[PDB]
Structure formats: C-alpha cells, structure tokens
Structure 1
C-alpha cells in the first residue's frame, strides 16, 4: 500500500490557530523551517510562543477532501521524525474525519498525547503511531473519510518542536 504523505518539503494546506495568537502561523498554517533541516529537506515548525486558552493545527491529507485509510488501520502507522527545543514536549495528536450524514458530529477527532509514543529530546527520533490505537475508538470516527492530521493543546506551557517526513504507511499489501 502506497504511503500517504502529509508533510515533505513545502507548506501544508490546512488551518492552524489559537484564541490569542500564541501559536505561530503564517497564512493560517504551520511555518516551514528552512534553517532547521533533516535528511536534506526543510522541517515543519509547531511553535506555541506564550502561555495563556486553546490552540489547534490541522494538516490536510488531500486539501480538505476525505481520504480512505480503512485498508491502513489493520497494521498501518503514522510515521514522522521529531525533535524539541529542549525536550519532553507534549501535545494532543490525532486525526479528524468528515461525514456529512452523521448528525451527532460532522467531524469527529480520535486523539492521544504524543508523550505516550515518544519522549521528545533535542535529538531527532523516528516515532511510529499505530493507526489501530486511534482509528478503532468507538467514537463514530470513520477511517474511510479522514481529512486531517491534528495537533492541539494538552498543557498551557510554551514549546517548540520540528517535524520531518510526516506520512501514513502500511506494510500490508
């Protein structure tokens, strides 16, 4: 099964923001860092600048269109490389779907905290998050209509992380 690239080398269509502007954004999306690189490509900067409160970052899989990831849930992963400005950074991480017929939630999120899957250091670490740990929650969430990867506030504390090569993979055939 083909990889589903979320971030590679350029700005990602989506929406990022916050109540007071604590989250750093440009054109309502995450900044791409060209000074901090990894594997000869730019990185994606998630940076909350002050304390305050809510923030959210949506990164589309296919420009807001739904993407069928149902064949990917069994054994698939969410893979990316990450490093922090100091270490031990934590935030909510997950996925959002869209189902117009589902009256109790046109869009449902399935989320976890990133510290469950990786302790962030000032060094690059490759982390894999199994889709079965999120996309099986009895939420009404539909893995065949996934629009976005989601980052959101867990704590009010300011941090900065960098992402590299964000992708959905499945070693299934």
Structure 2
C-alpha cells in the first residue's frame, strides 16, 4: 500500500501566514529553499523572521489541493514522516492535520496536533522523523481521518526560528 507525498521538491498549494507578517511566505505558501538542498532535492523553509506578540501564525500544506483525502486506512499503523534540519537547534511548534465535515456542527474543519518536540530534539542537522498516525488521529474530538484536507504547522511559543524540510509524506504498510 501507497505513499503520499505532502512535499517533495516544489511549493505546495496552500496557505501559510501570520498576524503582522512574521512568517516568511511567498504567495502565501511556504518559501521553497534551493540554496540549501538535501538528497539532491531542495527543501521546504519554515521561517518565522521576528518575535510574534500577535501570538499567531499558521501553515496549511494541502494534500489534494483543498480536497479531502480518505486516510482512514493509514491510521492504525501509519506515519507522517520526513526530514528536518534547523537554524540553531532546540526549536519547537505544532504539527498536524485538519479535516472537513459539513455535517458536524461544533466544528467544520478540526485540527489534530502535536508538538514536534515529542518526536524530536532539533539539531543543526538533518534527521529523519516519523510520527505514528495512531496517536493524533485518536482523541474523540471528532476528527474524521477519512476527510483530511491538510497538514498543519502552527505557533507554539512566540519565538522566531527557522527550520527546513524534505520529503514530507505519509506511509503505512
């Protein structure tokens, strides 16, 4: 059973943005870094220039251009997984998926998230990582894994950093 590329090599359909413009966007997706490859392949840049006392920013990297995908199959042994290096290490924010169900009243798209921290400490260095779907996609808050629309990156602490990405995908077995 089949992989899904969130990002490979060329910027993602989505939306990515901030209070007073603290997060570095291009056409409101994340900026794609060329000057800093990895694995032949270029990177995704996650950069928050200065200090948000807005206290917000967000990144939505879609899966099927704002369409729902069913992942339900993937869940119970699945992995968001990818690679990350960082600009000066020990850097943190949130991560996850939103979906979309119109039937549901108390929430249209919901998010399920965690803090990267839980899966990694960050080095000045490349480093694979794999989060079991399992954990997230299971907190009876309603989230319908049949119905995911995208991957998400949100603020944790207000402090500026950077990070880079490669080869963000979902896989199972």
How high is the TM-score relative to the length of structure 2? 0.98
Q: How far did residue 100 of structure 1 move?
A: 1.0
Runs of 4+ in 1 over 2 A off after TM superposition: none
Cα deviations across residues 149-170 of structure 1 (Å, max 9, x unaligned)? 0000000110000010000000
Q: How far did residue 98 of structure 1 move?
A: 0.5
Report how many aligned residue pairs link the two structures. Answer: 171
Distance 1:98 1:10 in 2: 25
Distance 1:35 1:155 in 2: 28
Task: List alignment gaps of at least 5 residues for structure 2.
Answer: none
Q: How far did residue 137 of structure 1 move?
A: 1.0
More strand by share: 1
Distance 1:123 1:42 in 2: 15
Cα deviations across residues 5-46 of structure 1 (Å, max 9, x unaligned)? 000010100100001000000001100000111110110000
Secondary structure class of the residue paired with 1:41: coil
Distance 2:122 2:82 in 1: 12
Cα deviations across residues 106-151 of structure 1 (Å, max 9, x unaligned)? 1000001000001010110000000001001111000000000000
Distance 2:66 2:91 in 1: 28
- RMSD between aligned alpha carbons? 0.5
Secondary structure class of the residue paired with 1:163: strand
Task: List alignment gaps of at least 5 residues for structure 1.
Answer: none
Distance 1:29 1:48 in 2: 13
Structure 1 equivalent of residue 42 of structure 2: 42
Of 39, 42, 60, the match for 1:58:
60
Q: How far did residue 94 of structure 1 move?
A: 0.7
Q: How far did residue 68 of structure 1 move?
A: 0.5
Distance 1:7 1:67 in 2: 15
Structure 1 equivalent of residue 13 of structure 2: 13
Structure 2 equivalent of residue 28 of structure 1: 28
Distance 2:123 2:63 in 1: 27
